[PDB]
Amino acid sequence: VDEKNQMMTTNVWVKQEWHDYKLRWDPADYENVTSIRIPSELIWRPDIVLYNNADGDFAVTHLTKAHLFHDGRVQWTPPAIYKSSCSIDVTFFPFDQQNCTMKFGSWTYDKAKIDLVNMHSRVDQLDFWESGEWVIVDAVGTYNTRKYECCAEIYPDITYAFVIRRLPLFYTINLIIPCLLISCLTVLVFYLPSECGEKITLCISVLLSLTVFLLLITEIIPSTSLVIPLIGEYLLFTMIFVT
Amino acid sequence: DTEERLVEHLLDPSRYNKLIRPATNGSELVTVQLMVSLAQLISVHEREQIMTTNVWLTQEWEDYRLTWKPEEFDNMKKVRLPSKHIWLPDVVLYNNADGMYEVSFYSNAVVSYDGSIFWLPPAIYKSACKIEVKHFPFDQQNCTMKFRSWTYDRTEIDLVLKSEVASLDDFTPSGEWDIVALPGRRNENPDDSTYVDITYDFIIRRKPLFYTINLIIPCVLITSLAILVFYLPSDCGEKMTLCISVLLALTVFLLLISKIVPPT
Amino acid sequence: DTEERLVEHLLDPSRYNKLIRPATNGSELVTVQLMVSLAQLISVHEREQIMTTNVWLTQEWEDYRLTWKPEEFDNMKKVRLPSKHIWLPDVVLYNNADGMYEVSFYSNAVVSYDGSIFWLPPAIYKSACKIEVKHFPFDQQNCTMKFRSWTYDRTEIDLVLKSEVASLDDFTPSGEWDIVALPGRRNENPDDSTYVDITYDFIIRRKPLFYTINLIIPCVLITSLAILVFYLPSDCGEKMTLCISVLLALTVFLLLISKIVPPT
Amino acid sequence: DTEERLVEHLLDPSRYNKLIRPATNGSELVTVQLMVSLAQLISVHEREQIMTTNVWLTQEWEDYRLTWKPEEFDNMKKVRLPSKHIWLPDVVLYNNADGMYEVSFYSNAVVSYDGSIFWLPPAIYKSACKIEVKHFPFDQQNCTMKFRSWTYDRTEIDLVLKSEVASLDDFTPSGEWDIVALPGRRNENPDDSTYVDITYDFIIRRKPLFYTINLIIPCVLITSLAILVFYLPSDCGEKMTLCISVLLALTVFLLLISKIVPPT
Ligand SMILES: c1cnc2cc3c(cc2n1)[C@@H]1CNC[C@H]3C1
Ligand SMILES: *[C@@H]1O[C@H](CO)[C@@H](O)[C@H](O)[C@H]1NC(C)=O
């Protein structure tokens, strides 16, 4: 989950299954076989395009072999990487909770010729590999139709929503502990007596250390302009009161 | 089944050689009406001057050896042909970084009974646009996109704009950069006689909050201590620390503003 | 000369077919015996938790419709075949970062006259592995490497091991990281009964000299001056310089061990 | 015209199956002679231990079923052929970092009427070599190159050298790294007997001026101020500034010298 470029790259296993009508036979006549496995360049397959792409394949491209049943029900699970684009809101930087989406749909057939029906409303996580930094709260998929600008038919699509939190202990122990720890040194220089000759050493060192912490926290957040992060407003008000 | 007999009839490789162009009547032009439609501006990259966009490029033209009588095939008006199996004029970018010239997907194409072909593939495109840097961070950039044909010229194909603006109703907010206008022009050259292209001009503007809060405010707070070492009496023995540290914080801020902007 | 006659006899498409598998006598399985052989640890990158290796994987199975008598063909026990025009099992990585699943080259397969087929391609692989960091940098990592089948499962093929370590014969030594042990296990799920995998584990010890010289010696030489501001007398006016310089040097070392180690 | 009749005669795919090897009497060998001609040494990268070079390697071998009777084809001694359609002996790298194994152009091969085939493709290669750094920056580095066959072995093809020192008169000079000596020799394993390779050694030397000027002179000019602090009087109030700033400049130089050298 890349916050400077606002991207999300996942490794996912797309499961599709459908019917046809010419790929059917009688199992009693061909020595009692039921199911075969033919490679997936030789049949029809539908065209499923991620609409939300940013530096993405825009379709599956590994082409795993397909399972065809006697009755014409075929099924197909090709794996893919996908590089989706989402919008990052960051106000509570220490304990964030983001919402990043995906939008699958068919490219050039409409609702009176092809039709998506979502199967299970969860995203199936029976072999998630535990990434450590982020945990999935929720992962749902909502069915949608939309009418576009070109053509007068309507088009179905399925929008997946991913609600993920950040486990916050690493940025707690490495960023707001030294910032909040040198932030209690700002009010101290008035206690120091003025014939020591050591006051403006302390004011210059506190001002330059908060300036280094603000110019290092401008790396990790994206450069948006709808919000400001709540740590950056505190660092700006502390720099105002130090000067 | 009748769709199968039509798709077998239309792409007979004895009948249909896809390397020729559909000229009739003693070398008329074919007219490729294109119009482009944005999806999202992904990123404007100031340091290497690359604008990455994601765009849909609707091209439609006229063919003449892909027709049928619709009574003979039980009232089809409109079929789908696997794209790149038919003829297509190569319409690409021309100001390109990284050498990806053609489109990214090669989807299906929708053939009527007229011979009119419709086509809409997507692309991600990386154009190389020239950054105005004077009023940073309040500036107003202007980036270009130039679509030319790739292998043909002006006596053979003929690009025609469809509508004067690029479309924008299938787009999401780009956040940091907002749009002002998107005109599109057809340039022919009067002198060359073999040169048509369609150039769009994205005119964008930076939302100036974030670079103000993280750059202009600590620069103003550091340069407000420029005039202050004269008001400080000399017997403390601390003038040198204040003016030396003001000059060092000022030169570190000059090098950071030197590493954001491009080196033009 | 006769080897061309043998390749013409075996891969005839009337006699041989590619898309089916050697299963007769009422759905027998086949046994794919696989074992890997290491070449070099290229890199362990802690910052994105990834590991790049260079693995030959050696597969043997038994394909029954590739046989001849060698007296007809000049006492040949052994030929080469192109690796696309036979059957393959499909064995890939399962926990792969960046999507590149299968092997690199498809090198040639050595086919005997029993039908027993020996085959080894080269591959590079970028596996993901959970970095255990508490004793940094004297640590001992544990990086997994899984292998499953891709299209088939346990009621059609059956993976089995050869020997219980990976072969370390062509392992050139690496420099930074040093191996300790490489066990190999076969796992199987008893609630599903349609699942095999063969997983290798690599248990790696880091040579500790480099990060000691750059990070442990200046950290102990800076934290040995923490309790020394008190013995300094108050007349000289130098307590603030020593204690402020110790606090800023410890914050700079805390941000360097922030930027190296993974952000779990 | 007659050359065109000859090239249709020679590469006829009923006559000439590509992926067998040219031998006639009960498995006799073929001899592949090779030598290496350098073009330039581009870079030696010390952070990741990788040498990038430009090298044309010349291979010549001897086929038998590329023969014509040259007074039938109107006194032709020497044709060119494209090298995707004849046999190749596979000669690759073997210590290769970043995983490109074949050559980069696949140029034409010159075929004489005897069958002796001359071939010279160009390549760039990213070889891996082990940088030793004790006498930095005056050292004498050593980087090797293995050429090994890829799908064959010692009882099938046999790599013979031609010149003990590889060719160096097409060399552009390299700026930093001058070349001292460059031999090459044949290795063969006395207990394995399925192993031939030809290894070249490159013995390169730094030119030491630029690293002396930038990292020995400011290092010595900083570290001569270690002994200075005892010659201050104590009453000035300026001891701790000098010795604290000397310690922080020294640890900055230790980290930058440790960013140049490898983490071996
Ligand atoms: C025919 C050919 N291409 C199309 C592309 C698209 C649509 C309709 C098309 N109809 C909209 C629906 N899906 C992708 C875009 C938009
Ligand atoms: C250079 O390295 C090779 C490989 O270890 C070795 O055979 C050779 O003796 C070395 N020569 C010198 C001069 O270091």
Residue numbers in the entry:
A (entry chain D): 50 to 292
B (entry chain E), C (entry chain C), D (entry chain B): 2 to 265
Question: What text does the study give?
Answer:
The cation-selective nicotinic acetylcholine receptor (nAChR) is a prototypical member of neurotransmitter-gated ion channels of the Cys-loop receptor family. The human α4β2 subtype is a heteropentamer and the α4, β2 subunits can assemble heterogeneously (2:3 or 3:2), which have nearly identical secondary structures. This hetero-oligomerization creates pseudosymmetry that makes the subunits indistinguishable at low resolution and thus, adds to the challenge of particle assignment in low-resolution cryoEM maps. To overcome this challenge, we explored use the anti-BRIL sAB as a fiducial mark for subunit identification and determination of stoichiometry, enabling reconstruction by cryoEM. We determined the cryoEM structures of the sAB bound receptor at a global resolution of 3.7 Å and 3.9 Å. BAK5 bound to the BRIL-fused α4 subunit broke the pentameric pseudosymmetry of the molecule, thereby enabling facile particle orientation during data processing and reconstruction. Insertion of BRIL did not introduce any local or global distortions in the structure as evident by superposition of the BRIL-fused α4 subunits with the α4 subunits from PDB ID: CNJ12 without any BRIL fusion (RMSD Cα = 0.7 Å).
The 12 kDa BRIL has a 4-helix bundle fold arranged with the N- and C- termini separated by a distance similar to that between adjacent TMHs of α-helical membrane proteins. Among the cohort of sABs, we identified sAB24 that was virtually universal—it bound under every manifestation of the BRIL incorporation. We affinity matured this sAB and obtained several variants with subnanomolar binding affinity to BRIL.
